[PDB]
Structure formats: structure tokens, C-alpha cells
Amino acid sequence: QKYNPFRYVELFIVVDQGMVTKNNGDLDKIKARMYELANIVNEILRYLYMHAALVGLEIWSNGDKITVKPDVDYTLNSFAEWRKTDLLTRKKHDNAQLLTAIDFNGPTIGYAYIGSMCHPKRSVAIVEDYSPINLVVAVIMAHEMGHNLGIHHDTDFCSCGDYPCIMGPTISNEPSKFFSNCSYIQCWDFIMKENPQCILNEPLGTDIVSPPVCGNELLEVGEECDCGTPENCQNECCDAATCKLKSGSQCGHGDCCEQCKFSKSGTECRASMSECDPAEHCTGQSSECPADVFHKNGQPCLDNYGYCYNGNCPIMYHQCYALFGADVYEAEDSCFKDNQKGNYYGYCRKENGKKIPCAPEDVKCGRLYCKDNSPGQNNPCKMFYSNDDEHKGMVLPGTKCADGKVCSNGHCVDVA
Amino acid sequence: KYNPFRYVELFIVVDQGMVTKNNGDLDKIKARMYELANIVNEILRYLYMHAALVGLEIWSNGDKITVKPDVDYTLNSFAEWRKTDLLTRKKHDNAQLLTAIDFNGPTIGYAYIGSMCHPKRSVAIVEDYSPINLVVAVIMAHEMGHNLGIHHDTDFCSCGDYPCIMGPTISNEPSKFFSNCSYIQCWDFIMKENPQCILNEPLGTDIVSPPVCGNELLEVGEECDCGTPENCQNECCDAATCKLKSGSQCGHGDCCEQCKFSKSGTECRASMSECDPAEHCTGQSSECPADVFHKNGQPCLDNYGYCYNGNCPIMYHQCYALFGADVYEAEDSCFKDNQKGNYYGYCRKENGKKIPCAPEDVKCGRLYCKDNSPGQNNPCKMFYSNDDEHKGMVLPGTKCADGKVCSNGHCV
Numbered sequence: 001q002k003y004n005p006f007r008y009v010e011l012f013i014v015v016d017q018g019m020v021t022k023n024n025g026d027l028d029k030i031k032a033r034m035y036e037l038a039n040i041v042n043e044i045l046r047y048l049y050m051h052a053a054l055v056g057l058e059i060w061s062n063g064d065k066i067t068v069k070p071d072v073d074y075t076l077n078s079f080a081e082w083r084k085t086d087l088l089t090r091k092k093h094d095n096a097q098l099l100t101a102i103d104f105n106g107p108t109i110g111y112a113y114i115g116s117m118c119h120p121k122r123s124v125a126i127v128e129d130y131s132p133i134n135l136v137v138a139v140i141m142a143h144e145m146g147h148n149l150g151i152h153h154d155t156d157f158c159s160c161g162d163y164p165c166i167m168g169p170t171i172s173n174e175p176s177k178f179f180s181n182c183s184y185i186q187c188w189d190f191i192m193k194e195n196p197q198c199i200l201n202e203p204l205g206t207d208i209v210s211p212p213v214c215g216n217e218l219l220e221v222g223e224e225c226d227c228g229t230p231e232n233c234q235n236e237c238c239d240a241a242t243c244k245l246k247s248g249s250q251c252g253h254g255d256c257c258e259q260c261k262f263s264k265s266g267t268e269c270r271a272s273m274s275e276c277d278p279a280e281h282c283t284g285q286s287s288e289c290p291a292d293v294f295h296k297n298g299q300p301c302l303d304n305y306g307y308c309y310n311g312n313c314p315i316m317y318h319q320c321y322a323l324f325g326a327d328v329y330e331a332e333d334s335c336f337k338d339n340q341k342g343n344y345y346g347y348c349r350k351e352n353g354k355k356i357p358c359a360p361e362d363v364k365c366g367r368l369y370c371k372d373n374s375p376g377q378n379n380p381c382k383m384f385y386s387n388d389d390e391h392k393g394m395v396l397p398g399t400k401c402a403d404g405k406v407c408s409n410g411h412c413v414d415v416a
Numbered sequence: 417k418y419n420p421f422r423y424v425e426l427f428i429v430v431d432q433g434m435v436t437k438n439n440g441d442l443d444k445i446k447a448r449m450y451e452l453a454n455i456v457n458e459i460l461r462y463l464y465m466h467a468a469l470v471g472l473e474i475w476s477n478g479d480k481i482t483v484k485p486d487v488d489y490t491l492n493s494f495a496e497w498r499k500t501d502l503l504t505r506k507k508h509d510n511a512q513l514l515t516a517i518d519f520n521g522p523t524i525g526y527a528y529i530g531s532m533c534h535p536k537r538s539v540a541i542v543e544d545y546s547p548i549n550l551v552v553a554v555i556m557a558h559e560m561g562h563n564l565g566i567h568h569d570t571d572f573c574s575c576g577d578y579p580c581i582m583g584p585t586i587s588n589e590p591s592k593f594f595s596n597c598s599y600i601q602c603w604d605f606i607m608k609e610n611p612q613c614i615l616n617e618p619l620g621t622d623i624v625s626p627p628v629c630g631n632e633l634l635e636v637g638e639e640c641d642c643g644t645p646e647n648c649q650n651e652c653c654d655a656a657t658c659k660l661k662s663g664s665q666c667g668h669g670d671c672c673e674q675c676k677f678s679k680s681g682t683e684c685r686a687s688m689s690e691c692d693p694a695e696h697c698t699g700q701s702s703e704c705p706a707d708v709f710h711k712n713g714q715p716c717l718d719n720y721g722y723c724y725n726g727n728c729p730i731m732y733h734q735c736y737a738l739f740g741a742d743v744y745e746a747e748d749s750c751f752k753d754n755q756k757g758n759y760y761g762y763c764r765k766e767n768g769k770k771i772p773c774a775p776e777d778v779k780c781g782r783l784y785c786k787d788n789s790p791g792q793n794n795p796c797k798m799f800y801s802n803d804d805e806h807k808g809m810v811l812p813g814t815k816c817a818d819g820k821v822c823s824n825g826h827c828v
């Protein structure tokens with residue numbers, strides 16, 4: 001299971017009603033451009049060791065499914081909410097942008113949550129159809145996505161050469177394709193230090209909706225392999241320019257592809273996480289590490305210390321350990337009553353602003369309590385809270401709150 | 417010149433139990449304390465650490481705290497003594513109480529985890545478990561390693577076929593070796609939570625125990641010292657005479673280029689700011705000058721700040737440190753939640769207890785910064801973690817007005 005240096009943003013573009021009428025209804029033409037923007041956005045991000053892959057296009061040729069308002073802050077929280085409640089529940093994807101004809105107040109031609117990549121709500125960005133030039137619109141797209149990647153503007157002695165850089169204070173008439181030194185650092189700081197696990201997988205060709213394109217470094221339909229331009233290709237299994245495999249190779253992609261041949265059967269290709277993570281192994285007859293399989297969510301795991309959840313086994317014990325280190329354990333039940341106060345630290349589910357208190361049963365599903373015996377600092381009900389992320393130190397969704405019960409969204413709901 | 421090592425400046429406090437046990441022979445106790453401290457420096461070398469005994473206090477009259485058999489009491493009591501008494505009249509990084517009175521849950525040692533340099537918590541307690549110096553020494557090494565965020569050797573950390581310093585339990589025949597985990601954790605805690613109080617190198621005169629040749633600590637009567645002749649790697653000093661070999665000039669301190677002097681203008685000390693007048697050497701100077709600063713209050717940085725202990729603290733620079741780029745100084749109006757008296761909003765502390773700011777001292781408690789993150793707009797964002805309520809307080813010495821500044825929670 002080799003380590004991929006790249007990440008991948010499985011993008012989802014939405015196009016507003018406004019934008020459509022601009023284009024006289026030509027749905028096919030829109031699609032065509034959204035396919036092209038995508039490839040320029042992936043071109044651009046390559047410097048950052050990142051790819052951009054269009055896994056969904058949804059044109060509101062019917063009508064805007066949210067009110068697209070001139071004030072760009074309302075509109076963004078609005079698109080972020082629809083992204084989460086409607087789009088996400090219908091389609092898997094990492095990041096969604098909204099292209100629009102609507103004139104924003106600023107004037108602002110782009111607006112996007114900082115360091116949000118992968119956040120169920122905030123991994124989003126609004127983008128003005130600020131020009132017919134695709135190089136321009138794509139630069140804006142890549143720019144906002146950069147903000148999501150937690151990149152801030154260039155300042156001071158940031159450089160991308162003697163051209164206009166992507167995260168420059170403001171856009172040029174004749175824009176370049178170049179992120180800046182400052183951008184590359186800030187972006188990889190965000191990955192290293194926030195880890196958006198969701199951009200980790202290479203998207204499958206079937207998964208991608210743009211006409212397959214050879215040399216974009218995205219394996220796609222009809223391609224036997226892809227490894228960029230002839231000048232960049234390190235894959236001696238692949239004819240960079242024709243995207244077909246070379247002579248004897250049975251493969252030129254995947255974790256189950258060695259030298260150029262298929263991986264021996266039994267060859268582990270996806271390491272197990274926990275006991276809710278059955279390992280995967282190569283078929284001996286294919287080129288890709290077989291799909292990932294977990295156990296039955298809710299399965300007695302860890303000598304019945306926990307009930308499974310997405311391949312892992314969340315037990316209060318480990319949760320303490322992470323927060324508070326060696327020799328610290330689960331606290332007295334009494335400690336959890338502080339969850340009903342509904343204050344800065346004690347609660348269950350923040351809904352979209354306020355801190356909702358805990359139900360006297362749901363108290364084992366808010367802020368966590370641990371019995372810290374750190375000499376000279378013994379404290380029965382040790383708790384953890386930073387407003388640097390109020391989630392650090394809340395019980396993980398999936399944790400036993402009793403027997404035959406788990407914490408689902410603030411609640412100690414029932415198991416089955 | 418960057419120094420790998422850190423230097424624990426240890427202070428030992430000996431209790432009454434001990435004293436009676438030695439029938440009051442102080443001249444003796446002193447002698448053993450010196451030995452212990454030396455043994456404890458040997459041990460530590462592996463962590464690239466040193467222990468230097470810069471203080472020793474035998475309670476041969478009164479006992480300065482009622483050391484109870486509840487180690488946790490004795491410990492918090494002895495910590496408060498350290499900081500509200502001992503530390504007032506003696507500079508020192510870490511302190512240890514050797515007792516001869518037995519503690520409860522059969523306890524030979526007791527120390528704060530990762531407490532190194534803490535005004536109150538930089539201490540540990542060790543028990544007169546044994547006449548055997550090396551046995552006692554090791555407890556001291558141990559409860560120090562605790563002080564340093566070092567944990568019990570889990571289940572398979574190793575150090576040869578010897579019992580290791582941070583083993584679950586002590587053996588009948590201890591050894592001077594720290595385990596690999598220990599090296600790791602040590603420096604993680606040092607890297608991560610860097611304690612500044614162990615960076616300076618003890619002056620030879622800062623040390624109270626009889627100078628030693630080949631202990632890796634420059635002292636009085638020594639020209640240089642670089643440990644055993646087996647470990648001494650600078651070809652400038654005979655590591656047994658400690659007075660430099662054939663025609664060597666110097667051998668320690670920054671200003672010594674392999675066995676000889678530096679020269680003039682040669683910058684010698686860091687310069688945190690413009691409030692730190694670099695200081696260079698001169699040749700004829702075997703070492704570096706004393707760290708000159710700037711008469712506190714000397715205007716600095718476009719007239720946004722006034723100096724302090726070497727740096728130049730301004731509100732803005734302090735928002736950027738906590739929150740990153742694009743987060744600037746908040747309007748005075750936010751700072752007003754510092755008279756609220758609540759978990760985040762005070763101006764200082766009297767006794768565990770928080771004092772709300774007077775309207776006057778307001779830009780002198782919790783910090784507030786303007787954060788316009790799209791979708792997450794917050795005009796008066798501040799930092800608060802129960803890991804350290806102090807993280808986010810305005811920095812002791814920061815400009816809060818034309819001419820006025822912050823000190824111990826006031827704009828004055």
C-alpha cells in the first residue's frame with residue numbers, strides 16, 4: 001500500500017440559474033466549460049502536489065435551490081447548508097463550488113471558508129462568473145479552493161516568479177497558473193496539521209464525469225494508464241502520450257501492481273486499522289487493491305468495551321489516553337452531569353450556533369470526563385476544552401454510553 | 417553557537433527525618449548530597465541533559481512544612497514552599513525534597529509530570545530508601561524524568577540486560593541507563609513544551625558542590641571540562657588536567673574557535689528584537705559579554721510598542737501568534753468582556769481566584785483579536801484552553817495606551 005504524495009479533491013461544481021440564462025439554456029455548452037475549468041484547476045494545483053477531479057455537475061436550469069443573495073456572506077452559509085443537507089446526502093465528494101452570475105457585494109468575485117477542506121458543511125466556495133475567459137474563472141476557482149486548503153494571500157516577499165500568483169492580494173487581467181512559495185507551505189501545513197483524510201483516495205475513472213483526458217494524471221475511462229506529459233512521466237509501465245500500457249506490463253497503476261505485473265495473491269494491499277477493519281489483499285488477477293470492507297457497525301469489539309463504527313472501535317479509554325496520556329482512565333458516571341448545565345464546555349450537540357444541553361441520559365455523550373491521577377494534580381472529573389476546536393474532547397460518535405447503546409450525534413441513542 | 421544540551425539547575429532540600437537519622441551530622445549529609453547530584457548527572461547524560469547542584473538546604477532546626485505521609489499533600493505543600501518561599505530568595509530550575517519519613521501508599525518518589533521550570537510545579541520528592549548512593553541517585557533521576565514528561569517503560573522499551581531508570585518498579589541493583597522511549601519522550605516534551613529555564617549554562621560559581629574533573633560541567637579551578645578522556649571530543653583540553661594541552665588558548669563558551677579566541681564585532685548573542693543590542697566579542701574575550709537590553713520603555717516598532725526583558729510585545733503580533741494570518745487587533749470594545757469575571761474574562765489572579773479588570777486595565781487581561789474568516793465572522797475572538805488558562809492573556813509588558821503599558825494586570 002504505497003504512500004501517495006498527492007491528495008485529490010473530488011470536486012462538485014454547481015451552476016446557478018442566473019448563470020444559465022446568461023448561456024441561453026445551452027446545458028451541453030455549460031457542461032462543456034465546467035469540464036474545461038476542472039482541467040485547468042487540476043493543472044494549476046499540480047504545483048501544490050494536489051489534483052482536482054470533477055465528480056459531479058449539477059446545473060440549476062430549473063431554479064436556484066437556495067436564494068443566491070448579493071451579500072456574499074449570507075449566500076455562502078446558505079450554499080454550505082444545502083451542500084450538507086441535500087447534496088452530500090445524495091453524492092459523495094470532497095469539495096463543492098458554486099458558479100454564479102449574481103453580482104456580489106464588495107464587489108466580491110469569490111468567497112470561501114478558510115481551512116475547511118473535507119468539513120461536511122464548510123468544504124465549499126462561491127465563485128463569480130467574472131469573465132468568459134476560462135483561464136480567469138479557473139484561477140478564481142483554484143484560488144477559493146486554496147482558501148479552503150487553508151492558504152492565505154501572498155504578502156511581503158511571497159513569490160511565484162515574475163507573474164501574478166494565485167493567492168495574490170487581487171486578480172490580474174493577464175493571470176498566471178502559478179501558486180506561490182507561501183502557498184505551497186501554508187497548504188501543506190494545513191494537510192500535515194489538520195489532516196483532511198477525505199482527500200486521500202485516488203478517484204476511480206468511473207467516478208469522474210469529465211471527458212476522460214490523457215495526460216492529466218488521472219486514470220480514466222479508455223485509459224490503460226496516465227502519468228502526465230511525456231516530459232513528466234516516471235511510469236515506465238505507461239506510454240505517457242497514448243495512455244496505453246507498454247509491451248509486457250499487465251499493469252501501470254494501483255497498489256497491487258508491482259514492477260509492471262500483478263501482485264501475488266495474499267499480498268496485503270490495505271493495512272488493517274482495528275478489529276473492525278478486515279484487511280484487503282491482492283487478487284493476483286487484477287491491478288487494484290480490492291474495495292475496503294469493515295465489520296458490521298455495532299459489533300461487539302474490544303472484549304465488549306465498544307461497538308464498531310466505520311472500521312474503528314471507539315472506547316472512552318483510548319479517548320482519554322489521547323487527551324491526557326498514559327495512566328488516565330474513564331471517570332465516575334457522576335462527572336457527566338456537568339453536561340446538563342449547557343455552558344462553554346458542558347453540552348451534547350451544538351446545532352448551528354447554540355450549545356444545546358444534555359439529556360440526563362445523554363450526559364455520557366457530550367464533553368468527556370476522565371479520572372486523571374497526575375501526581376500533585378489529581379482531579380476526579382478531568383475535562384478538555386479549547387475554543388480552538390470545541391470538538392476536541394467530546395465523545396466520539398460511535399462510543400458506548402452503556403450496554404447496547406452508542407453515542408449518535410450528541411445522543412446516547414440505542415444500538416441497533 | 418547552538419548548544420545541544422539542557423542544564424537542570426537542581427536544589428535539594430533535606431528534611432528532619434533525614435537529619436535525626438544522621439544524628440545531625442550536616443558536614444556529612446552535604447557530602448552525600450554532592451555525590452548524589454554527581455551520580456544524577458552521569459545518568460542524565462544519555463538524555464543529553466545535565467544536573468547541576470546550585471543549592472542545598474538542610475532543615476536541621478525546624479521543619480519548614482508539616483510533611484504528612486500523604487505524598488500528595490507533602491507534594492503540594494512542598495511545591496508551594498518552593499515557589500512562595502524558596503524561589504523568592506534563590507534562582508533555580510527544579511527542587512527535590514529528600515525525606516526520611518515514610519509515605520502512605522508505599523511511595524519512594526513522587527513528581528509532577530512535565531513540570532520542568534514551572535514556578536510551583538518544578539519539584540519532586542525522593543525517599544531515603546537506601547544508604548546506597550546509586551539507589552537514591554536513581555530515584556532522583558527517575559522523579560526528575562517524571563518532572564520531564566517521561567513515562568514508565570511501557571512493555572518493551574529497552575536498555576540492554578540492565579534494569580532501566582523509568583521501569584515500572586525499581587530493582588535491588590539499579591543501573592544508570594535511560595531507555596529509548598525515555599530519550600524520545602524527554603525531548604518531545606522539550607521540543608513540544610520547551611522549558612526555557614534549562615537553557616542557560618550554569619556558571620562555575622553558580623554551583624555549590626566541590627568541583628569535579630570530567631563531569632561535563634565547567635567549574636572553579638577548571639580551565640575546561642569535557643567529560644571523561646574517552647568522551648572528550650574537542651582537541652583543545654586535556655580531559656584530566658582540565659587546563660588545556662600544549663599551547664591551547666581557551667576551550668569553552670561561544671567565543672572560542674577550536675582552541676583559540678574570537679574577534680571584534682563578531683556577533684555573539686541572539687537579538688530577539690531591536691530591544692536587544694546584539695553584543696559581539698572583541699578577541700581578548702574568551703567568552704561573550706553579558707546580555708545588554710534596552711532601558712524598558714524605549715519606544716519600538718513604528719511606535720507601536722515599548723521594550724521588556726529584551727522583546728517588544730504588541731497586541732497585533734500577539735493575535736497573529738494565536739490565530740494565524742488575517743487576524744488583527746480588535747477594537748477596544750471587545751476587551752470589555754474582561755470585567756465579566758468569567759472563565760475567559762479576567763485581568764489577573766489573586767489566589768486561584770480571578771479578578772475582573774477595572775475599566776482602566778481592560779486591554780491588559782485576556783487578548784481579543786478581530787477575525788473575519790468568511791462564514792465564521794468573529795470580531796472579538798479570544799483564546800482559551802483549560803490546558804493553560806494563561807494562554808491568551810495579554811503578554812506581561814504590552815503597550816495598551818500612549819505611555820501606559822501592562823504589568824501584573826494593569827495599564828500603568
Ligand SMILES: CC(C)C[C@H](NC(=O)c1ccco1)C(=O)N[C@@H](Cc1c[nH]c2ccccc12)C(=O)O
Binds near residue numbers: 112170
Ligand atoms: C472585499 C473584496 C474587495 C475582495 C475581493 N473582490 C475583488 O477582488 C474584485 C471584484 C472585482 C474585481 O476585483 C474578492 O472577491 N476576493 C476573492 C477573490 C480573489 C482575491 N484574490 C484573488 C487572486 C486571484 C483570483 C481571485 C482572487 C478572494 O478569494 O479573496
Ligand SMILES: CC(C)C[C@H](NC(=O)c1ccco1)C(=O)N[C@@H](Cc1c[nH]c2ccccc12)C(=O)O
Binds near residue numbers: 525527583585
Ligand atoms: C503506590 C506505590 C506502590 C507506587 C510506587 N512504589 C514503589 O515503587 C515502591 C515501594 C517500595 C519499593 O518500591 C512508586 O511511587 N514508585 C515511584 C518510584 C519508581 C517507580 N519505578 C521506578 C523505577 C526506577 C526508579 C524509581 C521508580 C514512581 O514514580 O513510580
Ligand SMILES: *[C@@H]1O[C@H](CO)[C@@H](O)[C@H](O)[C@H]1NC(C)=O
Binds near residue numbers: 157159
Ligand atoms: C519566497 O521565495 C523568494 C525566492 O526568490 C524569497 O526571496 C522569498 O523571501 C521566499 N519567502 C518565503 C516565505 O518562502
Ligand SMILES: [Ca+2]
Binds near residue numbers: 009093
Ligand atoms: Ca476523496
Ligand SMILES: [Ca+2]
Binds near residue numbers: 216223
Ligand atoms: Ca487521464
Ligand SMILES: [Ca+2]
Binds near residue numbers: 293
Ligand atoms: Ca478494510
Ligand SMILES: [Ca+2]
Binds near residue numbers: 509
Ligand atoms: Ca537554569
Ligand SMILES: [Ca+2]
Binds near residue numbers: 634
Ligand atoms: Ca567539572
Ligand SMILES: [Ca+2]
Binds near residue numbers: 695
Ligand atoms: Ca544584546
Ligand SMILES: [Zn+2]
Binds near residue numbers: 143147153
Ligand atoms: Zn482570497
Ligand SMILES: [Zn+2]
Binds near residue numbers: 558562568
Ligand atoms: Zn515513576
